[PDB]
Design an enzyme around this catalytic site. Structure first.
Site, mmCIF file in Angstrom:
data_model
loop_
_atom_site.group_PDB
_atom_site.id
_atom_site.type_symbol
_atom_site.label_atom_id
_atom_site.label_comp_id
_atom_site.label_asym_id
_atom_site.label_seq_id
_atom_site.Cartn_x
_atom_site.Cartn_y
_atom_site.Cartn_z
ATOM 1 N N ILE A 71 0.848 -1.070 0.051
ATOM 2 C CA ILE A 71 0.032 0.069 0.181
ATOM 3 C C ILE A 71 0.919 1.064 -0.019
ATOM 4 O O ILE A 71 1.856 1.234 0.830
ATOM 5 C CB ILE A 71 -1.113 -0.140 1.180
ATOM 6 C CG1 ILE A 71 -1.956 -1.375 1.022
ATOM 7 C CG2 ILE A 71 -1.336 1.195 1.481
ATOM 8 C CD1 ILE A 71 -3.389 -1.353 1.900
ATOM 9 N N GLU A 160 -2.705 -8.864 2.319
ATOM 10 C CA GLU A 160 -2.182 -10.226 3.047
ATOM 11 C C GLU A 160 -3.392 -11.247 2.355
ATOM 12 O O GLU A 160 -3.092 -12.306 2.468
ATOM 13 C CB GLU A 160 -2.242 -10.039 4.413
ATOM 14 C CG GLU A 160 -1.246 -9.431 4.926
ATOM 15 C CD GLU A 160 0.308 -9.484 4.554
ATOM 16 O OE1 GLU A 160 0.501 -10.251 3.697
ATOM 17 O OE2 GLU A 160 1.275 -8.938 5.169
ATOM 18 N N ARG A 163 -2.646 -12.458 -1.109
ATOM 19 C CA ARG A 163 -1.390 -13.290 -1.200
ATOM 20 C C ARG A 163 -1.582 -14.791 -0.811
ATOM 21 O O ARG A 163 -0.889 -15.540 -0.982
ATOM 22 C CB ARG A 163 -0.308 -12.664 -0.475
ATOM 23 C CG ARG A 163 0.157 -11.194 -0.927
ATOM 24 C CD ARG A 163 1.152 -10.621 -0.010
ATOM 25 N NE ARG A 163 1.663 -9.415 -0.397
ATOM 26 C CZ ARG A 163 1.943 -8.308 0.462
ATOM 27 N NH1 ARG A 163 1.514 -8.398 1.930
ATOM 28 N NH2 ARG A 163 2.599 -7.095 0.371
#
Ligand SMILES: *[C@@H]1O[C@H](CO)[C@@H](O[C@@H]2O[C@H](CO)[C@@H](O)[C@H](O)[C@H]2NC(C)=O)[C@H](O)[C@H]1NC(C)=O
Length: 246
Positions: A71, A160, A163
């Site tokens: 980010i 997250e 991912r």
């Protein structure tokens, strides 16, 4: 761009936003069937824009680096906010160009720094969908200490979860209730670069990793990932950071 609205958000529209995020990220190849993020992208094309809407219908625009899923900053009304780091500053020449004002947060964007700022380790901070809503809400009016805590939620809930399928599942479980992340979630977040690298090195080594990864997988077990046949690889990990960026 990619969007998500908390109003009427269930484990399903959330699965759809996460699928949409991973899909907005460019890659030319697959390594063991997992998309391999580019080494570099030049220009504005380097940033993905995410629109997040809180339960009440207010938004923020989140800027993301398509290369590593980090980010960079966000826009709330006419103000842009960026982390205090080079990549974020260079990110500022390409997005939120019409913000009336730009604030640099007093911290960089890594967990260690954000955790000092917030006054709590992320293990002590609850995430789920309600928590995402709260975080949007709080980023809408500036407070550096509070923003730090909201960035810790936002990062885990967007980046997250894109991912790792395990992390996206955890969030869908916390859709109507928050809860601190498991031991396993923290471990994954922390070894992504490590794992991204070992999967790449395994090509040409018969799927055998050069250096074993120590993870904690659900039930609190302290495990070692030694090759590509492991479940973290075949199912979990959904994006790989290019070794050229490790
Ligand atoms: C690759 O992965 C699997 C696990 O994902 C490994 O299998 C383990 O191997 C050890 C050592 O021989 C056994 O004691 C374990 O019980 C095996 N577990 C399972 C679940 O199969 C495999 O060893 C790894 N490949 C190599 C070449 O080591």
């Amino acid at each position: 761009d990619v969007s998500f609205r908390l109003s009427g958000a269930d484990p399903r529209s959330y699965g759809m936003f996460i699928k949409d995020l991973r899909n907005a990220l460019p890659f030319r190849e697959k390594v063991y069937n997992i998309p391999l993020l580019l080494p570099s992208v030049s220009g504005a094309g380097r940033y993905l824009l995410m629109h997040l809407f809180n339960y009440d219908g207010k938004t923020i625009t989140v800027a993301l680096d398509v290369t590593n899923v980090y980010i960079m900053g966000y826009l709330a009304d006419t103000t842009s906010y960026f982390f205090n780091e080079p990549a974020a500053e260079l990110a500022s020449q390409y997005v939120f160009r019409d913000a009336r004002r730009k604030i640099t947060l007093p911290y960089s964007g890594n967990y260690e720094r954000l955790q000092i700022a917030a006054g709590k380790p992320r293990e002590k901070i609850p995430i789920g969908l309600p928590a995402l809503d709260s975080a949007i809400s709080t980023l809408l009016h500036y407070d550096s200490t509070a923003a730090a805590g909201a960035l810790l939620v936002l990062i885990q809930t967007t980046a997250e979860a894109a991912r790792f399928k395990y992390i996206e599942q955890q969030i869908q479980e916390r859709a109507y209730r928050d809860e601190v992340p498991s031991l396993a979630t923290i471990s994954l977040e922390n070894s992504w670069s490590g794992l991204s690298k070992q999967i790449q090195l395994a090509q040409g080594n018969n799927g055998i990793f050069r250096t074993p990864i120590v993870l904690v997988d659900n039930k609190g077990n302290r495990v070692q990932i030694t090759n590509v046949t492991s479940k973290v690889v075949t199912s979990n990990i959904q994006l790989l950071l290019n070794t050229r960026n490790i």
